[PDB]
Design a protein around this ligand. Structure first.
Ligand SMILES: Nc1ncnc2c1ncn2[C@@H]1O[C@H](C[C@@H](N)CC[C@H](N)C(=O)O)[C@@H](O)[C@H]1O
Lengths: 246, 198
């Protein structure tokens, strides 16, 4: 079966036909016990001194609102994103997860990662099925050769430091810019530390164990001193996957 | 000349100027992640192969970045990226942080291609894994629908990669099989005794 030919014939994307898309994942429970309270801050990231976000983070999830996300619907260009001072708030050993879209971001996001001192270690692809709307054509980017049915989240590492590099879900409704919550599952199961920052998060993405910072948040509870107290000794080096310290 | 054609060669040393111009180039290089060094990859004479058209470049590991460098050095802009989701026979999915379910194929453009059927296929291939490094045959049908009837060239292909409308180059092919009279003539003029050295 040539699923490419089939997509040409019917409009059903090949990924519509992927199937099934240890057991002992009580790791999930230790993650939840380890999780800091959810903390969040409304901030215009363009006009905000990012250095006010302390302490330095073990993990940064960066989800700038690209123009390509609003096809029928403030957008950030890669010019804007590249000028964020991410290296000023990343711990010397730390990780980044950068949503890059499907166009020029696959290149400019790599430029960003290197600019901020990371090297890419994974390329995580969000593959979108169209099982519910096979008869709904694209509207291609002018430079596009193919219909674009996926987005990429690049994982970067800096310093000396179960899941697959694919997320498969149905294409969300038009004007819905949310990324699959599965990305949080992957990140948390790497057990990278407990200082976790989500830039350009929203009220809808706030999550235990994460500091969410973004312009559309309606409320804040962030206090730098309170947040830092979650990680003071004896808790400074926990992975987020082990039992709490009595 | 439509039927499959091929040249067993060391792609580092073949004078690829004898081959003419191609609407589509595809390469699956043995990246140094029998490999080619980064410098040997950069120096491959890809620029002479096309004036206006597309390059399909398979990459893994750090060649996701090195492949982007080569693509740009050779004069292309990356404009798409095909993902091959690797499956078994039952359509189930088969880098030290994550298991890898996929391989990537960068799509570059050179010049201003006219008359290609862009947007017919989507950028995800779901196809069974076969032998090691054996890429899915689905890509040939995608490329044929994109650019029907035109001349194509594959670099680092194996015998099972030869296809109509394609010229295949690689060092595990069997001999030389050339039918296009333009190419035969220029091959004879350049390699009168059939030997491809230096
Ligand atoms: N200098 C070289 N010149 C030509 N071919 C080479 C050279 N070095 C390695 N190769 C061959 O390039 C091929 C690399 C493979 N990854 C190609 C896989 C092929 N695309 C497939 O679908 O099976 C192998 O046949 C190599 O033996």
């Amino acid at each position: 079966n040539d699923y490419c030919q089939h997509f040409v014939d019917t409009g059903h994307r090949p990924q519509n036909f992927i199937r099934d898309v240890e057991l002992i994942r009580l790791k999930d429970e230790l993650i939840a016990k380890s999780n800091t309270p959810p903390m969040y801050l409304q901030a215009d990231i363009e006009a905000f001194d990012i250095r006010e976000l302390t302490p330095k983070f073990d993990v940064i999830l960066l989800e700038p609102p690209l123009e390509e996300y609003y096809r029928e619907t403030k957008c950030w260009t890669w010019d804007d994103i590249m000028k964020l001072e991410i290296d000023e708030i990343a711990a010397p050993r730390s990780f980044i997860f950068l949503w890059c879209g499907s166009g020029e971001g696959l290149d400019l996001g790599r430029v960003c990662l290197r600019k901020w001192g990371y090297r890419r270690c994974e390329d995580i692809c969000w593959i979108k099925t169209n099982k519910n709307n096979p008869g709904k054509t694209k509207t291609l980017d002018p430079k596009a050769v193919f219909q674009r049915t996926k987005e990429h989240c690049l994982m970067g590492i800096k310093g000396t430091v179960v899941d697959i590099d694919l997320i498969i879900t149905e294409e969300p409704e038009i004007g819905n810019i949310e990324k699959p919550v599965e990305i949080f599952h992957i990140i948390e199961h790497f057990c990278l530390g407990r200082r976790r920052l989500h830039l350009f998060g929203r009220d809808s993405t706030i999550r235990p164990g994460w500091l969410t910072v973004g312009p559309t948040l309606t409320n804040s509870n962030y206090n730098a001193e309170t947040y830092a107290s979650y990680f003071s000794a004896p808790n400074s080096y926990l992975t987020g996957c082990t039992e709490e310290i009595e | 000349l439509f039927p499959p054609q091929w040249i067993c060669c060391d792609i580092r040393y073949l004078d690829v100027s004898i081959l003419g111009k191609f609407a589509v180039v595809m390469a699956d290089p043995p990246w140094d992640i029998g490999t080619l060094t980064d410098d040997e990859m950069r120096r491959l004479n890809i620029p002479v192969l096309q004036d206006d058209g597309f390059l399909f470049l398979w990459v893994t590991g750090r060649a996701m970045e090195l492949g982007r460098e080569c693509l740009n050095l050779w004069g292309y802009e990356r404009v798409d990226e095909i993902i091959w989701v690797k499956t078994n026979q039952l359509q189930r999915i088969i880098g030290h942080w994550l298991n890898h379910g996929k391989e990537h194929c960068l799509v570059g453009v050179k010049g201003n291609p006219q008359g290609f059927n862009q947007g017919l296929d989507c950028d995800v291939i779901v196809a069974e894994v076969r032998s090691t490094s054996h890429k899915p045959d689905e890509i040939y049908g995608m490329i044929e629908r994109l650019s029907p009837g035109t001349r194509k060239i594959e670099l680092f292909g194996r015998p099972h990669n030869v296809q109509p409308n394609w010229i295949t180059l690689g060092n595990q092919l069997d001999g030389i099989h050339l039918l296009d009279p333009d190419v035969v003539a220029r091959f004879k003029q350049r390699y009168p005794d059939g030997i491809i050295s230096k």
